[PDB]
Scaffold this active site. Structure first.
Site, PDB file in Angstrom:
ATOM      1  N   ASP A 151      22.685  58.904 -24.336  1.00  0.00           N
ATOM      2  CA  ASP A 151      24.074  59.098 -24.729  1.00  0.00           C
ATOM      3  C   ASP A 151      24.823  57.797 -24.477  1.00  0.00           C
ATOM      4  O   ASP A 151      25.107  57.448 -23.328  1.00  0.00           O
ATOM      5  CB  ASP A 151      24.702  60.254 -23.957  1.00  0.00           C
ATOM      6  N   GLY A 472       0.145  -7.613  -2.515  1.00  0.00           N
ATOM      7  CA  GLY A 472      -0.853  -7.745  -1.474  1.00  0.00           C
ATOM      8  C   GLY A 472      -2.070  -8.516  -1.935  1.00  0.00           C
ATOM      9  O   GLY A 472      -2.458  -8.430  -3.104  1.00  0.00           O
ATOM     10  N   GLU A 473      -2.679  -9.274  -1.027  1.00  0.00           N
ATOM     11  CA  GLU A 473      -3.874 -10.027  -1.369  1.00  0.00           C
ATOM     12  C   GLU A 473      -5.018  -9.076  -1.707  1.00  0.00           C
ATOM     13  O   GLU A 473      -4.999  -7.892  -1.364  1.00  0.00           O
ATOM     14  CB  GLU A 473      -4.276 -10.948  -0.217  1.00  0.00           C
ATOM     15  N   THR A 474      -6.022  -9.609  -2.400  1.00  0.00           N
ATOM     16  CA  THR A 474      -7.177  -8.806  -2.769  1.00  0.00           C
ATOM     17  C   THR A 474      -7.869  -8.258  -1.522  1.00  0.00           C
ATOM     18  O   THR A 474      -7.643  -8.716  -0.399  1.00  0.00           O
ATOM     19  CB  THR A 474      -8.162  -9.625  -3.602  1.00  0.00           C
ATOM     20  OG1 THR A 474      -8.558 -10.791  -2.869  1.00  0.00           O
ATOM     21  CG2 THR A 474      -7.522 -10.048  -4.912  1.00  0.00           C
ATOM     22  N   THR A 476      -7.232  -5.558  -0.172  1.00  0.00           N
ATOM     23  CA  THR A 476      -6.332  -4.670   0.548  1.00  0.00           C
ATOM     24  C   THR A 476      -6.518  -3.212   0.155  1.00  0.00           C
ATOM     25  O   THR A 476      -5.952  -2.334   0.812  1.00  0.00           O
ATOM     26  CB  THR A 476      -4.876  -5.073   0.308  1.00  0.00           C
ATOM     27  OG1 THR A 476      -4.035  -4.436   1.278  1.00  0.00           O
ATOM     28  CG2 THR A 476      -4.435  -4.654  -1.083  1.00  0.00           C
ATOM     29  N   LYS A 478      -5.516  -1.429  -2.592  1.00  0.00           N
ATOM     30  CA  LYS A 478      -4.453  -0.679  -3.248  1.00  0.00           C
ATOM     31  C   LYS A 478      -5.021   0.315  -4.252  1.00  0.00           C
ATOM     32  O   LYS A 478      -4.390   1.340  -4.539  1.00  0.00           O
ATOM     33  CB  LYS A 478      -3.478  -1.635  -3.931  1.00  0.00           C
ATOM     34  N   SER A 479      -6.211   0.033  -4.788  1.00  0.00           N
ATOM     35  CA  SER A 479      -6.868   0.981  -5.678  1.00  0.00           C
ATOM     36  C   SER A 479      -7.201   2.282  -4.962  1.00  0.00           C
ATOM     37  O   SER A 479      -7.205   3.347  -5.585  1.00  0.00           O
ATOM     38  CB  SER A 479      -8.132   0.359  -6.265  1.00  0.00           C
ATOM     39  OG  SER A 479      -7.819  -0.768  -7.066  1.00  0.00           O
TER      40      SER A 479
END
Ligand SMILES: [Zn+2]
Lengths: 751, 463
Positions: A151, A472-474, A476, A478-479
């Site tokens: 409704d 940064g130097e190699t 280090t 970072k990879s």
């Protein structure tokens, strides 16, 4: 408002409380009181209520299934209306409505009526007034006898509802009896606002149906058997003559061989109800519509579950298997239409099995989606393949809850709590690896904090205004950090080449321009050192353009060029960046992260013992890179990222540039700290020092300026930079030479 | 008779679907002319305008094969074309149209007349579009900081206000304004405020089209601007960088033209309309490869004198002639720009400036005096004068002052003119410019004779 504990009633008036109303009802069982609103404007917030009346008797099983489907349909429709108009959340409204509701009954066994009240959902009476047309369409566009009997009235100003336990009329002894589990008089009041934790609130024969002959043919087909008293029904005898049927075959509706009395057809709410006479439970009730498609109602029911929205760009995102998928090559709406048929009534499921009907009910959906929505708007959530992980609280949501967030991307792998731990040997090994990469000495303190901050911003869907440099130097490693971050953040992380660091950012069709869409991190490695002659300088235009919160780029065979930018850009190399163009914006938009860790094997360890490349040296191990490639410390590293984000993300976190570690910008810093723009009332000091002022501009000869600056700075170091700076600030004219304007800060301080 | 045609006629008679010159259809769905060609909206409109039909007709728009038939009838019945947005003194929001003539905003059918397709992308509800709001004072404070109300800062502030108010006028503006400061001394603030105010219509660009070839190719940058009411080119490429590119004057002339000739990528619709203001934000001085009297009429200069620094370097900033006043840097300005808090206040300020200057027009006037290099190119002509009838009657009177007479015209030797010009101009700096000016005005009477028909104003003034 904070709710209302006063109930105003009308005797055909009083203002009673819960205890007062209970005591009055107990004292007078036959008193007829209607609950209403004492003041429409003051406390317009009320509950959500509906009244249902169907003049037939149903057994327990039919009533149970019908009420389940009725709840499903009503809750979905109201939630859709709230989402489209009132700006609410669909999932929240659905949860609030289905969590708890109060359902009364009728003492009469010859008919089924009740008043249903949704406990936890509250809205203003104006909203219920506006819901009138939508609820009427829902009532007239369904097969469920309970839903068809709704409704739509009682949605008017200063309306009244009959209280439970009180006779509607003195002559009528039938009253509504409460049902479990409520059992309390305050659980059946549509004004008793009791806002609490688990609650939600929102606010802003007619010939026109069908030809008679077709309706009669539909009724005959429903009866299967022929009508004995055929050719007698007409417009006048529509609800008078009984329908006598030969029991050649058992009745389709009842499955029984025969019955004491024939059937009868009646008209209600634009539909035909077929029912038996005498014993009511001998045969069920058959409903026959009189208007509307069957394929349009299915489209409405699939649409108002909020599962096939369209994006602000024009792509229809569907919700299949607990994830917001979307594709512009093989659109997925038909897959959704097929997979959703289980949440639809029995008569609406057999239709979605012909592939020619799942294209009709799909064109309808596409025509009903006008206006768009926004996707991936909440940047403090990480979308995983099976849900969404919340970052501020750390709680994980899976299933329809993750639906609340239009997460169009995902990390690609599921979320597991067993691996998601705190004290594990993998966590300690990862901590040791990070310490090897980032020693925690007081000298490194600031650099380490910058490292953690710039590494934890990958869990942010917002836009960042800085580009940190990994210098940064190699050896280090970072990879290793790159691999750990990739494993932690999934496929959201992207690695790109230096193609954007030299060429024009937008230019032509750049894949990385489009790939920066919604990716949370972009990494560049092995930068093309510009120290040697020939290599292009780092494009200042590209760096400036990568900072904006928007990305402009169109790939081949495409037209869309607007992308949301969320990626944090990181560049890693062992060479100092060189940018031909320099400005204060660049000086305020570059950050540097320093690496002072050497990972070298023992064979060259002595060679690294006295090496000046790093502030420390330690033995390396070839057995770690593969371990990171094997997603070893993925979840522990993710936990570390979450902790860092929590400790770093204040109510507003910002990436602060560090323009001190860049050797190239040091020349500009020194020039600014020793020489700036030239102060009129200081002529005597200038005359004493030797400088002269002419034409309201203190000037010195170009040869004099070169002689003065010869001792302050190394000319052989940045002669080209000095010449370029002179050309930029050139003025020319005046006297017999060019004009140079500056103030020697070192000489300015000295009197 | 064929109900699917009566429905098509009824839908067409409300003027909801229109045909444009570009060949596409525009429909009035959800209070916005949804010009689109990917997914046609005629069926969406047919479904939408469905309750505004009798009951018998309205039950047949539920079958897709009949909505498509109604669409076919509409397409075959359109025939003729009507123009797109033409009214310049209007502002279309995604919630209606605002008339700037009286500042009256309204939506619905009353907004249907103005076929304004491109909008600002949001809604306007007049929440704070008034002068009594404290946000007006807050924004006016920043305006005073960036542009002081000092009586000396009259012409500069007038040009600032006019160049801002021109961003709303939808006609073609024939002047380019250069924003010349020291280093983002509020230029970025004004750019962000303007972007927040209108939005969508704003376009941001850096160099590119302003220096390269504006035609002869598929160059999409020039065609990208279309009906956009503001284009803002920042970071000019610092001409004095030992090889920096030079902005072509023909590109400037094309930009200020009422029409733009630019071929879209792989398209034949070269012509485009111009409704944008060319504003340049530059840190260094503007140097052009070629300057002519035509370019004198297309340059406007606006300067800033207040630099945004901080107390960390307040003393350093105070000792620079570039900045006339310094105020501490704000960090909440970024948040306000991000959340578009100052939308309505800045719109109200722009509308007030529009009313103030549109008496009855908002024409832009070039002001080449502020440009340093442009000064000499006109002073050289000012310091002299071409020989006229009055100077012709001088005869030997002018020759007695070291001049010569040829063909009843006063003329002087090339070396004498060079010596006279060098005695009052930067010969070293503008040697090539002086040579080019001499060559353009050179008059050749013989192979060996090179006498120009120009006389210095000093000789004419001296009796
Ligand atoms: Zn039966």
């Amino acid at each position: 408002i904070r709710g209302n504990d006063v109930i105003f009633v009308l005797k055909t008036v009083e203002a009673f409380k819960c205890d007062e109303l209970e005591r009055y009802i107990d004292n007078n069982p036959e008193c007829t009181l209607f609950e209403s609103l004492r003041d429409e404007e003051a406390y317009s917030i009320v509950r959500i209520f509906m009244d249902v009346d169907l003049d037939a008797c149903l057994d327990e099983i039919d009533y149970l299934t019908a009420i389940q489907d009725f709840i499903i349909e009503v809750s979905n429709c109201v939630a859709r209306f709230a989402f489209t108009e009132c700006g609410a959340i669909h999932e929240n409204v659905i949860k609030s409505m289905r969590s708890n509701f109060s359902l009364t009954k009728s003492t009469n066994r010859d008919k089924t009526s009740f008043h249903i009240i949704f406990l936890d959902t509250y809205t203003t009476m104006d909203t219920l007034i506006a819901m009138k047309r939508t609820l009427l369409e829902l009532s007239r566009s369904s097969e469920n006898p309970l839903t068809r009997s709704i409704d739509t009235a009682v949605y008017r100003r200063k309306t009244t509802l009959r209280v439970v336990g009180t006779r509607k009329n003195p002559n009528c002894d039938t009253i509504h009896v409460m049902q479990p589990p409520h059992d309390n008089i305050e659980d059946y009041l549509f004004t008793y606002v009791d806002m609490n934790n688990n609650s939600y609130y929102f606010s802003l024969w007619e010939p026109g149906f069908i030809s008679f002959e077709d309706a009669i043919k539909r009724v005959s087909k429903i009866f299967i058997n022929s009508i004995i008293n055929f050719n007698d029904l007409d417009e006048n005898n529509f609800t008078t003559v009984p329908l006598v049927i030969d029991y050649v075959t058992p009745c389709a509706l009842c499955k029984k061989r025969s019955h004491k009395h024939p059937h009868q057809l009646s008209l209600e709410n634009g539909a035909i109800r077929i029912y038996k006479t005498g014993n009511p439970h001998s045969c069920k009730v058959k409903i026959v519509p009189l208007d509307g498609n069957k394929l349009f109602n299915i489209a409405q029911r699939i649409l108002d579950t909020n599962s096939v929205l369209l994006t602000e760009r024009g792509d229809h995102i569907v919700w299949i298997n607990n994830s917001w998928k979307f594709n512009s090559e093989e659109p997925l709406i038909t897959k959704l239409i097929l997979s959703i048929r289980h949440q639809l009534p029995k008569e609406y499921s057999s239709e979605l099995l012909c592939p020619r009907k799942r294209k009709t009910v799909e064109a309808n959906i596409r025509d009903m989606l006008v206006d768009s929505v926004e996707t991936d708007t909440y940047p403090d959530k990480l979308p995983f393949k099976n849900g969404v992980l919340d970052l501020v609280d750390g709680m994980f949501y899976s299933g329809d809850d993750a639906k609340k967030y239009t997460c169009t991307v995902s990390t690609g792998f599921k979320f597991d709590d067993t691996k998601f731990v705190e004290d594990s040997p993998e966590m300690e090994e990862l901590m040791n690896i990070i310490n090897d990469i980032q020693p925690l000495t007081d000298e490194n303190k600031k650099n380490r904090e910058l490292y953690e901050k710039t590494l934890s911003s990958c869990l942010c869907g917002a836009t960042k205004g800085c580009l940190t440099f990994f210098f940064g130097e190699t050896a280090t490693g970072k990879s290793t950090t790159k691999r750990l971050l990739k494993s932690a953040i999934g496929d959201l992380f992207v690695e790109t080449g230096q193609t954007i660091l030299t060429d024009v950012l937008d230019k032509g069709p750049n894949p990385f321009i489009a790939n920066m869409h919604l990716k949370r991190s972009v990494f560049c490695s092995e930068l093309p050192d510009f120290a040697c002659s020939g290599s292009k300088k780092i494009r200042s235009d590209n760096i400036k353009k990568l900072t904006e919160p928007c990305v402009i780029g169109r790939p081949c065979f495409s037209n869309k060029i607007n992308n949301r930018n969320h990626a944090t850009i990181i560049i890693d190399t062992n060479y100092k960046p060189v940018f031909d163009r320099i400005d204060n914006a660049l000086m305020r938009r570059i950050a540097v992260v320093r690496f002072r860790t050497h990972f070298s094997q023992p064979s060259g360890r002595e060679a690294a013992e006295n090496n000046d490349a790093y502030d420390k040296v330690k033995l390396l191990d070839e057995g770690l890179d593969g371990k990171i490639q094997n997603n070893r410390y993925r979840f522990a590293f993710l936990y570390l990222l979450v902790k860092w984000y929590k400790k770093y993300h204040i109510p507003i976190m910002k990436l602060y540039p560090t323009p001190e570690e860049i050797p190239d910008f040091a020349f500009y810093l020194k020039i600014g700290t020793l020489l700036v723009s030239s102060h009129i009332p200081l002529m005597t000091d200038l005359s004493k020092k030797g400088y002269i002022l002419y034409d309201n501009v203190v000037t010195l000869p170009l040869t004099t300026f070169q002689q003065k600056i010869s001792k302050y700075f190394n000319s052989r170091l940045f002669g080209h930079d000095i010449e370029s700076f002179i050309n930029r600030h050139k003025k020319f004219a005046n006297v017999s030479d060019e004009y140079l304007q500056y103030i020697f800060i070192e000489d300015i301080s000295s009197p």
